[PDB]
Design a protein around this nucleic acid. Sequence first.
DNA 1: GCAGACACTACGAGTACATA
Lengths: 329, 546, 348, 325, 174
Amino acid sequence: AKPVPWVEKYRPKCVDEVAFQEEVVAVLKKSLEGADLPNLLFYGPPGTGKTSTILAAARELFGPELFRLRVLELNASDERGIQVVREKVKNFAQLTVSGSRSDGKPCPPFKIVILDEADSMTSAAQAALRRTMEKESKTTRFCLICNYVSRIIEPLTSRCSKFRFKPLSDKIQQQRLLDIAKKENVKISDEGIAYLVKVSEGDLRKAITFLQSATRLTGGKEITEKVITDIAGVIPAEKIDGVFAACQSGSFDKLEAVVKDLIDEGHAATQLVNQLHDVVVENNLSDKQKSIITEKLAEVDKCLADGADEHLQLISLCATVMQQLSQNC
Amino acid sequence: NPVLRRPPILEDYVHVTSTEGVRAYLVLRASSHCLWVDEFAPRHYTELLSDDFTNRCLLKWLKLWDLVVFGHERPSSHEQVLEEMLEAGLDPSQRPKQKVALLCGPPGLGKTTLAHVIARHAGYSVVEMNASDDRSPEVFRTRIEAATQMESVLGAGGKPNCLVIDEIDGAPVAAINVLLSILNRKGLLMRPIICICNDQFAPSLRQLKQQAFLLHFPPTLPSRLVQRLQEVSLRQGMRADPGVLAALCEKTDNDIRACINTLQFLYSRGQRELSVRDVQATRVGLKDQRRGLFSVWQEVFQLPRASLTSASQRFYRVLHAAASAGEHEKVVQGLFDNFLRLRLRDSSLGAVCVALDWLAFDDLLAGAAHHSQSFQLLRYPPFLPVAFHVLFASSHTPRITFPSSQQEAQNRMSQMRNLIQTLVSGIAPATRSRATPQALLLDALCLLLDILAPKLRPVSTQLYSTREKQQLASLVGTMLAYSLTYRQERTPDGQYIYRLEPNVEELCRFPELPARKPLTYQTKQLIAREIEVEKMRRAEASARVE
Amino acid sequence: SLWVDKYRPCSLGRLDYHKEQAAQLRNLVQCGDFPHLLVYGPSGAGKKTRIMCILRELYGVGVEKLRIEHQTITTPSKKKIEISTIASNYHLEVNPSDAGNSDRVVIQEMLKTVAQSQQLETNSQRDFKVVLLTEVDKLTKDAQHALRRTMEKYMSTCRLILCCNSTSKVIPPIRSRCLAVRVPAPSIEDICHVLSTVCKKEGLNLPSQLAHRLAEKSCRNLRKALLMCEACRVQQYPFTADQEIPETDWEVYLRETANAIVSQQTPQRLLEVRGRLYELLTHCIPPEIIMKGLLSELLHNCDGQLKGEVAQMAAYYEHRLQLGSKAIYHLEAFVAKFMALYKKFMED
Amino acid sequence: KIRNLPWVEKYRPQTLNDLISHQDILSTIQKFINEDRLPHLLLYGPPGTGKTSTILACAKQLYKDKEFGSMVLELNASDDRGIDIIRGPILSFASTRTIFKKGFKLVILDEADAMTQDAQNALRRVIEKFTENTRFCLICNYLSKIIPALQSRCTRFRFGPLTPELMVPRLEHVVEEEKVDISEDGMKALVTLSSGDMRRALNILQSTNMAFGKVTEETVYTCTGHPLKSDIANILDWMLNQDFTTAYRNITELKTLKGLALHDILTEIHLFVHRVDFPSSVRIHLLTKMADIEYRLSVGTNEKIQLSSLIAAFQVTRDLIVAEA
Amino acid sequence: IEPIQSRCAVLRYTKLTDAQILTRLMNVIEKERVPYTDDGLEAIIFTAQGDMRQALNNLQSTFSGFGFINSENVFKVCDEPHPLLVKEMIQHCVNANIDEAYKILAHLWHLGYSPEDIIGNIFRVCKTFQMAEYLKLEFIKEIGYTHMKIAEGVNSLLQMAGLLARLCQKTMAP
DNA sequence: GCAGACACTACGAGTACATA
Ligand SMILES: Nc1ncnc2c1ncn2[C@@H]1O[C@H](COP(=O)(O)OP(=O)(O)OP(O)(O)=S)[C@@H](O)[C@H]1O
Ligand SMILES: Nc1ncnc2c1ncn2[C@@H]1O[C@H](COP(=O)(O)OP(=O)(O)OP(O)(O)=S)[C@@H](O)[C@H]1O
Ligand SMILES: Nc1ncnc2c1ncn2[C@@H]1O[C@H](COP(=O)(O)OP(=O)(O)OP(O)(O)=S)[C@@H](O)[C@H]1O
Ligand SMILES: Nc1ncnc2c1ncn2[C@@H]1O[C@H](COP(=O)(O)OP(=O)(O)O)[C@@H](O)[C@H]1O
Ligand SMILES: [Mg+2]
Ligand SMILES: [Mg+2]
Ligand SMILES: [Mg+2]
């Protein structure tokens, strides 16, 4: 009777528990009925449900007794070189489908190879997979899971039926979070759940983690909007107004001061980029100023994506929008 | 005009509107049994074609070996070092201080020919070692021990054995180690050994150059080469004027073997008179030449002296020779270390900025080729030396030095990382987890060294104050917590100093900083003495507690 | 023992600053089903103190009895690499960035052996173990992509507390899997209160002005502030208001390097500055801190219509430095571009 | 009998008549087979065009089922194809005779671009010396990964992309044999979203038949997730007609309602820019900007900021286009 | 290596002249009795590009597939050489003409050429193109910068059009 | 019959490089 965190406790065990990915869920449901399951490719933003859908599907198709004999799951946490693809994947794909389910539920006549996080596979190791799927598809199936389809080579993209996992809508995420909160004997206000589905941005794992952490922080009382704001790392609006006041001042000393304030208070630059962009696209600036400020925001977000330093990127973006605000002064 | 004020009548249109609210419209729709190199090969000393000095030096080096081998007292800049070392005397073993001779140079001059001619001239019998042997260390050892450590089987009148080792640069490191092991047996070496190589700067021949009679081969003079080619052509009964022979000499790079083979192909028996257009054609006799690093840097940084004045020809020549040199990383390091020492005419530093952009582009390409396993990106970093040639083309004479800043920086960085790993491992694990080595280096070292060195008077502990005793005990505790101590060290000037066992002052101090007052010998000795007696007292306290 | 380690708090209720966050972390880990944590903030804020306080709250007092453990891991190139590890009877701490680019091997082999093994004693030790991955911002992208399934499969048995400085260097697959805990730097008043409490616990007297100057000179780093407070105690026991605070050698060396940049803009001065940057890089200073100190000092000597271009130039060349592999190329490119811009500004 | 196979492998052109597009190349290959003069082939092109199926139909036509193991040595990238294999099993297969029936052999080397340069250099004299006894077929997607000696030794047939006019009747045959209800716009959407690739056309058809049961333009563009041409035209109209906040609100509302991705939006906008009569400088600036945005989406970046930059790339040039007049 | 080349008379062969291919084409045609026209044999020579193996292979393929050598019978099974269009498209990129350069790029894209082959022939054409040296160097740097993005995984028509637009930008940015 | 000597192949290990 050990405690289990809510991201694994509420992990879909069946295909009907997956939310908002309607087309692929219907595809696997017809495959559950007995239709011809093709080779699958799952790609999209994190937290959308790529791993859980195929794991619940394989549990549905094979049951508990046939998961070890029909499913080979490979991730980036183990070694996937050219030799692992050439030996281990090929020997598994050349195996026989033997063993039926003992509960009377139908058993599919194929195996499933789950290559989760297939961006990390090399281009040479992906090239060795092609005729493995072309030749041994009578007795096995392949499911590649990734986040960026550009990291998958075009033969492997062409061989697999691509399903894009969309970011979750506000409505479906709201009902799923409300159902999880109802099942856990906890309460949350309308503004709190609205701010939760605004913060999570289609990430159900992040939403469940924030809901569980707010439940543990409050202890079981009302989960209001303020615990959501201080649990998400959301920068307060006064800091953004101070940043824009320092930008409209036209002096680099106050700009450095507020950038050092935001760096020293532990605020992430991704959250500052998001909130800054939300302020710029919703004010009375000119179209040219908004255009090059948003272009600088895109290039700063890209430079933060390759792990550059926070302070220098923030001082460059703040210098650019300072120049844009002080050009018309 | 692509933009129409009036809307199109038949074609589809896409609207475009400015911020001032006006509209514009676009459009949506045995003479014949031998080679000539072997027929015209030198058999005597007087028909050699090398530099005369090198011949005198090799002959005089072999003629002084007579005292130990033949048992006879009488035999019958780079210039000054070789002339001094020949008359340098003998060590107490009646044998030369240089036990092998290393013959270095480009291919096609006669190093093997001079070695064989000198060995057969001095009464020796030539024993040939080549790259066609096995060259394993055991095989190398038994073959040198067979060639050099016994006399002739014929007895009296038998010629002594001269070991000639062609292509020593292709031998492995352990073969050179075996050769140096048999060189320095104090089973003494009683026979001369001649080693022939094509590149002295190989990593396997570093130690050999500190022990050998270093003979450097200059390229052959064109006058003697043209006269020898004239003798070769006249002995075959055919005519070639010396202009086309000089053109062949300049084309084949002062090579006797390449020029004689090219003359053998171009003559045949159909015609007797060689044409200039046949030699000036590139279809025969042209070989790719492995250019040196210094020649590549000289051709990049210096313009050719004044056709050949076209810039595209210089572009292609610099690119082709920099690609043909090989060792691209060393060329990049030399261009990085030599492009700031020139008389640069770009005072606005635009050329320096775009040269650093090109170097960062090369580095990004190397990282992308070694990261994504896509090695087809390595066709562009050959264009880095031609970019440096385009940017820094000058008519001056630059002094190009060998690159060493990146290598010494990497060595020094590895040394300080080893020192950091030494410092961290001595720290107790209760306080190791509380700070990373990066934060301990950036924050907790120089201030820690300021803690460890206060103002202390040269006064014994019996005359110290109670505050002094508390300060001294606290400092000894801070020394013992970080596992630091002082030890004795020796200096060549003759005095004793104290220094830390992890020498963390190099991790802390910087060369251009202003100086600070260090602790004295009395203070440092007294601190080390309290470190030892505090270790003894802590052992006594551990025995008393347990 | 120095002042940074002698007066570290043990429990969550003993922390003088961020007490509301201490109560929130007390309520977070009480049940034991708390998710993976991403403790992030500026360096010297007190992240490791809060992590060890969480470990004290979860298990007994046996998390303070540590030991050095060594493990040799085999690379795919069959070259053995030794990695050090702080371990306890309840938790373990790994720094995979000591292995260089072979941190992916450490994640793939070392972490799975810890995560796939259930704990030997289930009554004294709790139902889960904690792995401390320290400095995950320096991890390569391959190691972070190898990390994620270990944080999903064996989560209910092997919990993780990731510690870093910047969450921008953490990939969003990892950032989605863990609850981010923000630890900001303490302000001037909290650092002054901590320094005054430390000095009063040692029997000393510390003035408010000296503590304020120690707080501003440390740039909101409590470790650095306590270190210069101990150094100021060592050099002069009477704590005057205008007592000189000692400084680290690499910071003043960076200041003199930037002064040499400002003083002359010539290719041989560029060569001398490159030698100074080689001296800074060989002392294991990270290149982004060299760039930050350079921008911190070179902007003092710039005029008001030049600081934005220098800041954008520094950020651009820092991003190119993080994309590349050799630091000296991008550092010297930034310095040369600054000399060109400074010469164009002064000559016009 | 019914089989559990994907439709890209259940419906494979076992004969040369079942392939659709490259009629002249296949007629020449059939005349090579019928006259017993088949040379060393080099089949290259984009993926999904039918290069593996062509040589499998050739091997099935040349050799019967009772002697297929003695004549075809098929090696692809899944098998180890080092220089030991070229100097070993491949050379021994090429230099020996046949066990059962007298005839010429065939060595099929699928994914010949993935072979090393040492194996490709060792393959030259095996091809040249034993050309009477065996023939070598190299199938690749990238011709730059094959050394020019192997390109000289083998006559090359460019298996280009499948045009949608001849790609329709094969899809009609698959539809008729699979009992699938499909409209005209559904087939148009299949041959448009496939883009010269019959593998992903069958994958889209199978996925849409499983997801919806019917194949219409709405069902295909919903299952694939691609934006329709009218919505891309609306996005271009919003980016070229209105101000920043209103166009941002419209495009964000469309992307939230439809669940669109920025990669397909960038691809279709890049296709619509070259059709729109832009000035040269405006087109150059737009192409550079969309190249920067599409490069930026390959990492862990925020898609909203890139969408704002995509709007910004047209709001910059609106004033330039209008003042151009 | 250089010592082996010094031991020989290193003969160097040049690419075959069209008349030299044409004489052996006469030889093979009269021993094989191949009906032909002149323009088809110029098409065979154009497809061969100094390669006699390619000339014989294309002649045998055209004779086996159609039985007669005209221009459109040759071009039905053979192909026009790729870098001859890349030279004209690089020339269009030199005069900052993005429309014709994109027309040639889209024609090569619809023929089924992978981005790796296109960018490799772009680099080979720009290696020996006749322009300024600094313009060629920044062109080669831009080609390598685009080839990095091709190698990491993103390879579409948009990246190639962006490379063409950046090459057109390099001319207008002195 | 069993101990010693011979060559035999499989396997471990170190090193280089990958482009036009
Ligand atoms: N569609 C969904 N329906 C229900 N729960 C979901 C859904 N998506 C995510 N979750 C929850 O979030 C957890 C994580 O989902 P995952 O499937 O691992 O996300 P993901 O697609 O794997 O993201 P990446 O790409 O691996 S970082 C699951 O265990 C569920 O608890
Ligand atoms: N004076 C000469 N006249 C004519 N031919 C000569 C003369 N001297 C040497 N040769 C020939 O030129 C060649 C000399 O080169 P070798 O001594 O054999 O080798 P090497 O010069 O040491 O260069 P490498 O590095 O071994 S290729 C031989 O083929 C000789 O026969
Ligand atoms: N010309 C064609 N005619 C009919 N069906 C085709 C054609 N080309 C492809 N297909 C279908 O697509 C499937 C895959 O074709 P393949 O021959 O494997 O493609 P490919 O030419 O091998 O491409 P790559 O480079 O190997 S990924 C076949 O099984 C057919 O169902
Ligand atoms: N609440 C606190 N009270 C007293 N001292 C603290 C407190 N928090 C941190 N410190 C001190 O400040 C320093 C901060 O270092 P650490 O706790 O490792 O955080 P970081 O990992 O961010 O450097 C520690 O040496 C610790 O002794
Ligand atoms: Mg996953
Ligand atoms: Mg020789
Ligand atoms: Mg295929």
